[PDB]
Scaffold this motif. Structure first.
Motif, mmCIF file in Angstrom:
data_model
loop_
_atom_site.group_PDB
_atom_site.id
_atom_site.type_symbol
_atom_site.label_atom_id
_atom_site.label_comp_id
_atom_site.label_asym_id
_atom_site.label_seq_id
_atom_site.Cartn_x
_atom_site.Cartn_y
_atom_site.Cartn_z
ATOM 1 N N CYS A 19 0.875 -1.165 -0.057
ATOM 2 C CA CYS A 19 0.218 -0.026 0.043
ATOM 3 C C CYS A 19 0.965 1.199 0.116
ATOM 4 O O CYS A 19 0.441 2.279 -0.168
ATOM 5 C CB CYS A 19 -0.938 -0.029 1.086
ATOM 6 S SG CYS A 19 -0.251 0.049 2.749
ATOM 7 N N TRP A 51 9.913 17.836 -12.780
ATOM 8 C CA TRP A 51 9.506 16.496 -13.417
ATOM 9 C C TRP A 51 10.181 15.310 -12.971
ATOM 10 O O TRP A 51 9.571 14.276 -12.760
ATOM 11 C CB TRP A 51 9.926 16.712 -14.889
ATOM 12 C CG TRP A 51 10.091 15.499 -15.828
ATOM 13 C CD1 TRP A 51 11.067 15.089 -16.384
ATOM 14 C CD2 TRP A 51 9.022 14.397 -16.062
ATOM 15 N NE1 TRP A 51 10.968 13.843 -16.927
ATOM 16 C CE2 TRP A 51 9.557 13.385 -16.860
ATOM 17 C CE3 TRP A 51 7.858 14.251 -15.593
ATOM 18 C CZ2 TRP A 51 9.055 12.219 -17.191
ATOM 19 C CZ3 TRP A 51 7.115 13.091 -15.980
ATOM 20 C CH2 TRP A 51 7.784 12.152 -16.999
ATOM 21 N N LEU A 58 6.145 8.750 -9.194
ATOM 22 C CA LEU A 58 4.791 7.826 -10.007
ATOM 23 C C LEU A 58 5.634 6.671 -10.320
ATOM 24 O O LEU A 58 4.719 5.606 -10.305
ATOM 25 C CB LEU A 58 4.363 8.876 -10.897
ATOM 26 C CG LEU A 58 3.423 10.066 -10.843
ATOM 27 C CD1 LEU A 58 3.272 11.011 -11.772
ATOM 28 C CD2 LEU A 58 2.107 9.530 -10.311
ATOM 29 N N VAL A 95 -2.873 3.635 -9.382
ATOM 30 C CA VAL A 95 -2.134 4.780 -8.657
ATOM 31 C C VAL A 95 -3.172 5.980 -8.357
ATOM 32 O O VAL A 95 -2.973 6.384 -7.462
ATOM 33 C CB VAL A 95 -0.755 5.273 -9.541
ATOM 34 C CG1 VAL A 95 -0.469 6.610 -8.912
ATOM 35 C CG2 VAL A 95 0.272 4.121 -9.487
ATOM 36 N N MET A 99 -4.516 7.299 -4.809
ATOM 37 C CA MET A 99 -4.000 8.642 -4.358
ATOM 38 C C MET A 99 -4.874 9.483 -3.307
ATOM 39 O O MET A 99 -4.921 10.145 -2.583
ATOM 40 C CB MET A 99 -4.311 9.730 -5.763
ATOM 41 C CG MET A 99 -3.983 11.185 -5.532
ATOM 42 S SD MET A 99 -4.076 12.091 -6.913
ATOM 43 C CE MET A 99 -4.145 13.812 -6.122
ATOM 44 N N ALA A 102 -4.266 9.710 0.259
ATOM 45 C CA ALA A 102 -3.286 10.448 0.388
ATOM 46 C C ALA A 102 -3.888 12.057 0.443
ATOM 47 O O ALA A 102 -3.004 12.789 0.000
ATOM 48 C CB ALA A 102 -1.866 10.351 -0.118
ATOM 49 N N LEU A 125 5.293 22.501 -13.649
ATOM 50 C CA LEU A 125 5.112 21.538 -14.641
ATOM 51 C C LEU A 125 4.128 22.005 -15.687
ATOM 52 O O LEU A 125 4.235 21.352 -16.748
ATOM 53 C CB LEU A 125 4.601 20.411 -13.963
ATOM 54 C CG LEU A 125 5.407 19.641 -13.033
ATOM 55 C CD1 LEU A 125 4.708 18.452 -12.261
ATOM 56 C CD2 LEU A 125 6.806 18.953 -13.885
ATOM 57 N N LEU A 130 -4.655 19.206 -16.280
ATOM 58 C CA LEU A 130 -4.404 17.767 -16.037
ATOM 59 C C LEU A 130 -4.416 17.491 -14.664
ATOM 60 O O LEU A 130 -5.244 16.568 -13.809
ATOM 61 C CB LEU A 130 -3.280 17.343 -16.871
ATOM 62 C CG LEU A 130 -2.912 15.826 -16.494
ATOM 63 C CD1 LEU A 130 -4.136 14.911 -16.756
ATOM 64 C CD2 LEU A 130 -1.702 15.211 -17.116
ATOM 65 N N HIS A 213 -3.410 11.322 -18.358
ATOM 66 C CA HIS A 213 -2.096 11.367 -17.553
ATOM 67 C C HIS A 213 -0.884 10.497 -18.304
ATOM 68 O O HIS A 213 0.123 11.218 -18.270
ATOM 69 C CB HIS A 213 -2.395 10.530 -16.261
ATOM 70 C CG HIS A 213 -1.359 11.044 -15.209
ATOM 71 N ND1 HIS A 213 -1.031 10.050 -14.048
ATOM 72 C CD2 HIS A 213 -0.413 11.883 -15.169
ATOM 73 C CE1 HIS A 213 -0.323 10.756 -13.284
ATOM 74 N NE2 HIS A 213 0.056 11.789 -13.964
ATOM 75 N N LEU A 217 2.693 12.225 -19.391
ATOM 76 C CA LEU A 217 4.002 11.407 -18.699
ATOM 77 C C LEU A 217 4.776 11.101 -19.976
ATOM 78 O O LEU A 217 6.085 11.090 -19.769
ATOM 79 C CB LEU A 217 3.633 10.207 -18.083
ATOM 80 C CG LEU A 217 3.068 10.344 -16.595
ATOM 81 C CD1 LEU A 217 2.604 9.282 -15.711
ATOM 82 C CD2 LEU A 217 3.816 11.331 -15.642
#
Ligand SMILES: O=C(O)c1ccc(-c2nn(C(=O)c3c(Cl)cccc3C(F)(F)F)c3ccccc23)cc1
Ligand SMILES: C[C@H](CCCC(C)(C)O)[C@H]1CC[C@H]2[C@@H]3CC=C4C[C@@H](O)CC[C@]4(C)[C@H]3CC[C@]12C
Length: 241
Positions: A19, A51, A58, A95, A99, A102, A125, A130, A213, A217
């Motif tokens: 986790c 980044w 990530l 992911v 989130m 958190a 960024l 986004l 996303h 990336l």
């Protein structure tokens, strides 16, 4: 007792082991918020430094989800093509769901590098639309107040989806998916939590956000590529080609 009660236990155990951040820690640290100064510190960093920080966080988050998958009953007995197909489509969806643990809906902050900060932390960024979609997705998940076992079972079903294009043994993925669906329904019934079923994100929305996303990336990876030690090299090679 039943093959289903064990499946619930083995999914929750896999989740507990992978986790990445402990819920009690995340709940305990909500009062530990970046100051105006710490925030302008992040905002003044180069795009390329932010980044590098965010890409590595990530990638590590993805690696916890790969390990989660590897520990789900039946995942390792799928052929390698289907393992890659499921994680490629699903790992970043997991992911994005993870989130919400958190994320503090009260002040719209995320736990990042040891403190809670708003989406303005990431200004350098130049991703504001986004990043805003990611915070809003976490904000709408926060309303479900997912239990750890709910998040475990739901994220298992996010990954084990026979509808992903490209699967070579569709029927083998269907058998795992149906056992996990029964495990999830059984668990919600036992806990009087079936009401979350009507409130889960529409599938289209998670796939859509995840697609936007990963495309962003891939553009950053294209301009300023990071490297990591690949946990699952066949999957890694198909993302970092
Ligand atoms: O350790 C590994 O084996 C591994 C580690 C990570 C992945 C993986 N990265 N990823 C990204 O989007 C990504 C990230 Cl998180 C950071 C930087 C660049 C990228 C990009 F280039 F792929 F766009 C994914 C999306 C969806 C599914 C799996 C992954 C895959 C494998
Ligand atoms: C939303 C922002 C910005 C994303 C920037 C972009 C679009 C270039 O990737 C990202 C950056 C780092 C991300 C966190 C990394 C690790 C974790 C731990 C995992 O258990 C749960 C998700 C979480 C908190 C990520 C959330 C999204 C974050 C803040």
């Amino acid at each position: 007792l039943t093959e289903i009660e064990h499946l619930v236990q083995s999914v929750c155990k896999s989740y507990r082991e992978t986790c990445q951040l402990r819920l009690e820690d995340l709940l305990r640290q909500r009062s530990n918020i970046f100051s105006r100064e710490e925030v302008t510190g992040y905002q003044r960093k180069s795009m390329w430094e932010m980044w590098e920080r965010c890409a590595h966080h990530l990638t590590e988050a993805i690696q916890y989800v790969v390990e989660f998958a590897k520990r789900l009953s039946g995942f390792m007995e799928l052929c390698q093509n289907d393992q890659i197909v499921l994680l490629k489509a699903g790992a970043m969806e997991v992911v994005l769901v993870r989130m919400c643990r958190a994320y503090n809906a009260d002040n719209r902050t995320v736990f990042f590098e040891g403190k809670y900060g708003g989406m303005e932390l990431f200004r350098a960024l130049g991703c504001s639309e986004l990043i805003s979609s990611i915070f809003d997705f976490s904000h709408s998940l926060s309303a479900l107040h997912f239990s750890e076992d709910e998040i475990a079972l739901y994220t298992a079903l996010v990954l084990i989806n026979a509808h992903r294009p490209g699967l070579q043994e569709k029927r083998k993925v269907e058998q795992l998916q149906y056992n996990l669906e029964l495990a999830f329904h059984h668990h919600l019934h036992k806990t009087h939590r079936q009401s979350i079923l009507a409130k889960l994100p529409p599938k289209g929305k998670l796939r859509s956000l995840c697609s936007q996303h990963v495309e962003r990336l891939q553009i950053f990876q294209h301009l300023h590529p990071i490297v990591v030690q690949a946990a699952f090299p066949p999957l890694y090679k198909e993302l970092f080609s």
